[PDB]
Design a protein around this ligand. Structure first.
Ligand SMILES: [Mg+2]
Ligand SMILES: [Mg+2]
Ligand SMILES: [Mg+2]
Ligand SMILES: [Mg+2]
Ligand SMILES: [Mg+2]
Ligand SMILES: [Mg+2]
Ligand SMILES: [Mg+2]
Ligand SMILES: [Mg+2]
Ligand SMILES: [Mg+2]
Ligand SMILES: [Mg+2]
Ligand SMILES: [Mg+2]
Ligand SMILES: [Mg+2]
Ligand SMILES: [Mg+2]
Ligand SMILES: [Mg+2]
Ligand SMILES: [Mg+2]
Ligand SMILES: [Mg+2]
Ligand SMILES: [Mg+2]
Ligand SMILES: [Mg+2]
Ligand SMILES: [Mg+2]
Ligand SMILES: [Mg+2]
Ligand SMILES: [Mg+2]
Ligand SMILES: [Mg+2]
Ligand SMILES: [Mg+2]
Ligand SMILES: [Mg+2]
Ligand SMILES: [Mg+2]
Ligand SMILES: [Mg+2]
Ligand SMILES: [Mg+2]
Ligand SMILES: [Mg+2]
Ligand SMILES: [Mg+2]
Ligand SMILES: [Mg+2]
Ligand SMILES: [Mg+2]
Ligand SMILES: [Mg+2]
Ligand SMILES: [Mg+2]
Ligand SMILES: [Mg+2]
Ligand SMILES: [Mg+2]
Ligand SMILES: [Mg+2]
Ligand SMILES: [Mg+2]
Ligand SMILES: [Mg+2]
Ligand SMILES: [Mg+2]
Ligand SMILES: [Mg+2]
Ligand SMILES: [Mg+2]
Ligand SMILES: [Mg+2]
Ligand SMILES: [Mg+2]
Ligand SMILES: [Mg+2]
Ligand SMILES: [Mg+2]
Ligand SMILES: [Mg+2]
Ligand SMILES: [Mg+2]
Ligand SMILES: [Mg+2]
Ligand SMILES: [Mg+2]
Ligand SMILES: [Mg+2]
Ligand SMILES: [Mg+2]
Ligand SMILES: [Mg+2]
Ligand SMILES: [Mg+2]
Ligand SMILES: [Mg+2]
Ligand SMILES: [Mg+2]
Ligand SMILES: [Mg+2]
Ligand SMILES: [Mg+2]
Ligand SMILES: [Mg+2]
Ligand SMILES: [Mg+2]
Ligand SMILES: [Mg+2]
Ligand SMILES: [Mg+2]
Ligand SMILES: [Mg+2]
Ligand SMILES: [Mg+2]
Ligand SMILES: [Mg+2]
Ligand SMILES: [Mg+2]
Ligand SMILES: [Mg+2]
Ligand SMILES: [Mg+2]
Ligand SMILES: [Mg+2]
Ligand SMILES: [Mg+2]
Ligand SMILES: [Mg+2]
Ligand SMILES: [Mg+2]
Ligand SMILES: [Mg+2]
Ligand SMILES: [Mg+2]
Ligand SMILES: [Mg+2]
Ligand SMILES: [Mg+2]
Ligand SMILES: [Mg+2]
Ligand SMILES: [Mg+2]
Ligand SMILES: [Mg+2]
Ligand SMILES: [Mg+2]
Ligand SMILES: [Mg+2]
Ligand SMILES: [Mg+2]
Lengths: 94, 22, 77, 62, 103, 46
RNA sequence: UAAGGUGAUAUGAACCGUUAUAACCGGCGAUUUCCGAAUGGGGAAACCCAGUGUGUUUCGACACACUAUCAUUAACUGAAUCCAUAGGUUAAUGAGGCGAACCGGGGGAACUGAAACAUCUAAGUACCCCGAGGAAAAGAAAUCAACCGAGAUUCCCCCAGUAGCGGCGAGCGAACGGGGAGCAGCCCAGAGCCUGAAUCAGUGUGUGUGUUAGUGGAAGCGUCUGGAAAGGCGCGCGAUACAGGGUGACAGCCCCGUACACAAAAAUGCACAUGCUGUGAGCUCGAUGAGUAGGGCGGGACACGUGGUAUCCUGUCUGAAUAUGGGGGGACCAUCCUCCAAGGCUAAAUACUCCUGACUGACCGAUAGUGAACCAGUACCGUGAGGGAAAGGCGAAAAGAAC
RNA sequence: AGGACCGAACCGACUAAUGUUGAAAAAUUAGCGGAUGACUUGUGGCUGGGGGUGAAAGGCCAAUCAAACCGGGAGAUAGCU
RNA sequence: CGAAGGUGUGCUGUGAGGCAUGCUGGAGGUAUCAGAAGUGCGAAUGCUGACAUAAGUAACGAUAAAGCGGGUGAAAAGCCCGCUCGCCGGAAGACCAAGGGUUCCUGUCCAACGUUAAUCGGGGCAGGGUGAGUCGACCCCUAAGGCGAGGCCGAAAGGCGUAGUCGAUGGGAAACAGGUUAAUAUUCCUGUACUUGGUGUUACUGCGAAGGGGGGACGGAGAAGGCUAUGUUGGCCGGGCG
RNA sequence: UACGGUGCUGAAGCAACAAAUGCCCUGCUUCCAGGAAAAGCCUCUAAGCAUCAGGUAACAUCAAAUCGUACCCCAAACCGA
């Protein structure tokens, strides 16, 4: 069991997209953006005791950020783990 | 924008031993 | 290393000269041989690697004197 | 604030901090939205994270 | 420390607007003050579609250094350099010439 | 023609990399030189 | 300390405080993911994988702590072989690694010089390797002279490019002695006697003594030019401050600042005193550092290269003496003089700025200056070691030229 | 069965034109030899410079080789320009 | 009321050279004797930075090859569509390897970049984009070697080397078919399967190993035998009567 | 319908012959140049044992990470400026 102090840090924001705006209705899935030290335990216990909702199974990946050039000098945005969280039958977020 | 200014190719000493004078 | 366990006789370097007095870079090697030493005050055989000067200082300065000094100086037998 | 929070328990702060973390995480989840039109709420809540989490070590093991 | 305060009423030694007073609006980074009604200059402006501005020649109030201004004295009709005493232990500003505290 | 250099990171980073130049002796006499100029790309780790 | 803050290009949104808990500065702390000596095993650095004693547990799995390695001290265990022995298993302080110059050691060259070149010089210089400190080394007479003496070590100026050495060529180079800076002498090879005794090496404390933030600090107004007076032109004032820094151009009196006067809850150096922690000066004396001194044998360090060579160091077999001796006084001998080797300790004077503060400078002012005044040991180039750039100026504040 | 033959991919580089501040700092085109073997090849470990490796050509060891390349004594030295 | 610098003129010393002054330029120059010099450019096949020269010449990176209608626009020889016509098809096709680091996909945008124009682009700019018990790496195990406490050896660093612990390109668990977005999918979805670990119970009661053995476990050539991936034809089904 | 798309339906789904350089084949034959190790697994035992524990014979389970995943891949995206 993951303690609440470690649990409460694992999220930043939900993630707006077209594939979020398809996976919300046509397959009922949600698109997190978690911290980089997050495993399937630290999101399967983290969608549950943070919205008081349930979960079917979780999936993630490690998006590597693009390369930006502000001015004439190079720049590298921070990487960020994108989590796909499938919700059970009979679930609906706030 | 801007650009560089290239130089200094390996110019192969510009010749073989062409002028065989012997 | 070619280092005598008693004297501290480290190898040094000189120049091998000649009848025409030339110059090169030689080494001088100390005279090491392995040896076993009887002791009665411990009643055993102690192994040692020792110079040729060491194998005659060991019959004057007492065997157990050197065998006690080598515990203190820092070079174990 | 710490001159007020200094006279609290060893264990009452270990509910105070979790309540601050709950509302901090609420503020971080609303920080997704383009609705959270208060800037300094997040930073002052981070400072209240700081003072509490250093009084935690200033009492628990000092 | 900056003996010219914020809400004080200062006068201008030299510049395009010497002689006239003002009630100091604020002070910028390294001492530059914005006299409310003195450092006046026209400024052009492209109309912006953020915050709903139509564009115009906005006349905002510009900046001027500390060494152009000085605190006006209510008593002698001119300016005065300002000094520091320690009255009651309080570091309090007070006038150099005429020897009497201002607040 | 096959050029001067046909890359293979699986050997490049163990025959030039940081732990390779830390294992020997005089690699600690190249890592003891690159900081004199202070190289921000210290060695050939990516 | 305080009326304005939230580092910058880079504005803005949204906020906070005014009688001092806004910020900013200083001192002590708590924080300190991961890699790196990396130290739990490993590993293409920033990752991968565990083991153990122990606290939760919605019994899914968690959060903490530790574990290299030798050295050292052990406690214990421990076989060939019975008591005993190597080895093994735990503890605990030390250490490793990095860093510029500088010092001390252990190894060690070349083109060049001689118009070639081997002996020589280039030189114990470059370069590696070890080890240590802020200083290091060396050291308290087996040292010189010359019948008169001096009185440890180092360093500076001389003696002097002299006397010497040298294919007596190139070239190298003393010393005795004199002026200086600067001075401190001790102790074990040992018994006793004052026995806990002067000193000595850490502790904390008081006083100054700084260092780490700070505070005040003189005096000037009007006219003409022009964008503007800080200017010229009048009349003053201040000055233990007229050096510099900026302000719409040259400012002692506009503004920070200096001369001057002050300041610390905390830390901390550098001294006397302190209660200590631990070690011990003072007399009678005996006893004077043996595989060593010198020599046989090569050798390299003495300016000193085979020289007619003293001195010291040592790889090799030798090898004594012991207050009556023994070394030295430039082969060697005799006399005389002087000194007690074969063990330690020890400050300044000197050498050095990677880094810190303050000033100056007939030093630079952008193709200079450090490679770099600008986001540079970066871009670009080489697999790599390593090399290595170019690139400041609007104006007074952007007042950046709306329509 | 074959260091057998003819001939693909693959190697290899013999002949000729083109190309030689070319498309390429060694190649295109058209013909050519080996082509179940002393072969060729993927990727990976090993060999250090008076040294390696070499069916041994003084060829090769990063387009450089009768001693690679990178710093240093280097301001080697040059009686010649 | 105009300093240094540039510029033109006007005088002037036997000269290097000065004085004076119109113009630009908007903050410093500087007497006179004196002092110290990184103190004077035509070179050096010098070195940087700029502009000429050939020159509006060569060349435009295959001799596979393009023509046309429509649209976008200020723009079309290439950009989108559509029809012919060419060309590859053991490649010039598809998926992956070692490699590369946003090139993939839309919304724009044309200055520079494409040996042209440019709406277009692998170009700028803004956003979107990778999902696993099964594929692969990590991980269990070793080869060649590498590291390597001890130990042995070496002036010192170090050098091999024992036990070990490292080392893929090989040895060991697993699974597929269909649909989907502008982009991924054996990973998402219905479908249906499979393995490997601790668990709690059900009856069964020899497990125990750093050890013992069988296995994993292996070269080259040819030769057949049955077979499918695929290919062809017929039967069928649907469309058509050119 | 957004004339780009998509939603909703859907018969036949057989046979024969041909056939590998793909499978059995990690096989067979036969020749000499005579053709890896270790683990997962199969299995037997001692130091150890207790009527325990562990053991496969069942099944409800609970679990099975982290990282790679887009794109080109004999190329306009790698090495050749
Ligand atoms: Mg020599
Ligand atoms: Mg003040
Ligand atoms: Mg001013
Ligand atoms: Mg290598
Ligand atoms: Mg800021
Ligand atoms: Mg570690
Ligand atoms: Mg491992
Ligand atoms: Mg390691
Ligand atoms: Mg020579
Ligand atoms: Mg020579
Ligand atoms: Mg010569
Ligand atoms: Mg000393
Ligand atoms: Mg005397
Ligand atoms: Mg003042
Ligand atoms: Mg002695
Ligand atoms: Mg002697
Ligand atoms: Mg002797
Ligand atoms: Mg002698
Ligand atoms: Mg001799
Ligand atoms: Mg003596
Ligand atoms: Mg002595
Ligand atoms: Mg300039
Ligand atoms: Mg420069
Ligand atoms: Mg590179
Ligand atoms: Mg060939
Ligand atoms: Mg030929
Ligand atoms: Mg051909
Ligand atoms: Mg053939
Ligand atoms: Mg053949
Ligand atoms: Mg030959
Ligand atoms: Mg070559
Ligand atoms: Mg060489
Ligand atoms: Mg050489
Ligand atoms: Mg030199
Ligand atoms: Mg030269
Ligand atoms: Mg001028
Ligand atoms: Mg002029
Ligand atoms: Mg002018
Ligand atoms: Mg001006
Ligand atoms: Mg000036
Ligand atoms: Mg000159
Ligand atoms: Mg010129
Ligand atoms: Mg000339
Ligand atoms: Mg020239
Ligand atoms: Mg030139
Ligand atoms: Mg030209
Ligand atoms: Mg032309
Ligand atoms: Mg022509
Ligand atoms: Mg022509
Ligand atoms: Mg032409
Ligand atoms: Mg073409
Ligand atoms: Mg073309
Ligand atoms: Mg057309
Ligand atoms: Mg065309
Ligand atoms: Mg088309
Ligand atoms: Mg065709
Ligand atoms: Mg293709
Ligand atoms: Mg990009
Ligand atoms: Mg694209
Ligand atoms: Mg173009
Ligand atoms: Mg155009
Ligand atoms: Mg496009
Ligand atoms: Mg693009
Ligand atoms: Mg995934
Ligand atoms: Mg799934
Ligand atoms: Mg091995
Ligand atoms: Mg090794
Ligand atoms: Mg070792
Ligand atoms: Mg392994
Ligand atoms: Mg593999
Ligand atoms: Mg494998
Ligand atoms: Mg697998
Ligand atoms: Mg795709
Ligand atoms: Mg077995
Ligand atoms: Mg076979
Ligand atoms: Mg078939
Ligand atoms: Mg079929
Ligand atoms: Mg017809
Ligand atoms: Mg793909
Ligand atoms: Mg190509
Ligand atoms: Mg090329």
């Amino acid at each position: 069991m993951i303690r609440e102090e470690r649990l409460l840090k694992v999220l930043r924001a939900p993630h707006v997209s077209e594939k979020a705006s398809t996976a919300m209705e046509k397959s009922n899935t949600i698109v997190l953006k978690v911290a980089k030290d997050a495993t399937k335990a630290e999101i399967k216990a983290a969608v549950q005791k943070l919205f008081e909702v349930e979960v079917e199974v979780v999936n993630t990946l490690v998006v590597k950020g693009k390369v930006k050039r502000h001015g004439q000098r190079i720049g590298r945005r921070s990487d960020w783990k994108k989590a796909y969280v499938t919700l059970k039958e009979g679930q609906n977020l706030d | 924008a801007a650009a560089a200014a290239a130089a200094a190719a390996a110019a192969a000493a510009a010749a073989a031993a062409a002028a065989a004078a012997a | 290393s070619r280092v005598c366990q008693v004297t501290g006789k480290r190898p040094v370097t000189g120049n091998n000269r000649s009848h025409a007095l030339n110059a090169t870079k030689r080494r001088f090697l100390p005279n090491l041989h392995s040896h076993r030493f009887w002791v009665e005050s411990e009643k055993r055989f102690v192994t040692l690697r020792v110079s040729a000067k060491g194998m005659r200082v060991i019959d004057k300065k007492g065997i157990d004197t050197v065998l006690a000094e080598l515990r203190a100086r820092g070079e174990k037998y | 604030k710490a001159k007020e929070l200094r006279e609290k328990s060893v264990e009452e702060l270990n509910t105070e901090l979790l309540n601050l973390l709950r509302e901090q995480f609420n503020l971080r989840m609303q920080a997704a939205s383009g609705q959270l039109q208060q800037s300094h709420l997040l930073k002052q809540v981070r400072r209240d994270v700081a003072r509490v989490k250093t009084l935690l070590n200033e009492k628990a093991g000092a | 420390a900056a003996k010219i305060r914020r809400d004080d009423e200062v006068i201008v030694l030299t510049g395009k607007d010497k002689g006239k007073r003002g009630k100091v609006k604020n002070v910028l980074s390294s001492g530059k003050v914005i006299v409310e009604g003195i450092n006046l200059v026209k400024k052009h402006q492209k109309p912006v579609p953020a915050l709903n501005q139509p564009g115009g020649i906005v006349e905002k109030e510009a900046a001027i250094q500390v060494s152009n201004v000085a605190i006006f004295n209510a008593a002698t009709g001119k300016a005065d350099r300002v000094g520091f005493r320690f009255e009651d232990g309080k570091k309090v500003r007070f006038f150099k010439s005429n020897s009497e505290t201002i607040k | 023609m096959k050029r001067t250099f046909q890359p293979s990171v699986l050997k490049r980073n163990r025959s030039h990399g940081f732990r390779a130049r830390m294992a020997t002796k005089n690699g600690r006499q190249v890592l003891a030189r690159r900081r004199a100029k202070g190289r921000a790309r210290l060695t050939v780790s990516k």
